[PDB]
Structure 1
């Protein structure tokens, strides 16, 4: 789909971040509020049957 630039802070320090396994997009989609900055219009999916 077509779409509906951040400085270095104290918060996004990569020296504080442990890079062990690469985080993908389906992690952001399955859990929309844990890994997302500005999660505006997401919808909560079904968990499990």
Structure 2
């Protein structure tokens, strides 16, 4: 789609153990992003 909007995160202070896989931003939207505006919740398991 098109963009809807258009000393803390130091790279020497963050353990990159597993690469942040992009689908985490869908599966858990608040925890993996800053500013989640107009976000929708997901039904996740039946």
If the TM-score is normalised by the length of the shorter chain, which range does it land in?
A: 0.7 to 0.9
Indicate the RMSD between aligned Cα atoms, in angstroms: 3.5
Between 1 and 2, higher relative CO (CA 8 Å, sep ≥ 6) is seen in 2
Aligned length: 45
- Is there any run of 5+ residues in structure 2 with no aligned partner, and where? none
Q: TM-score by structure 2 length?
A: 0.84
Structure 1: tracts of 5 or more residues without a match: none
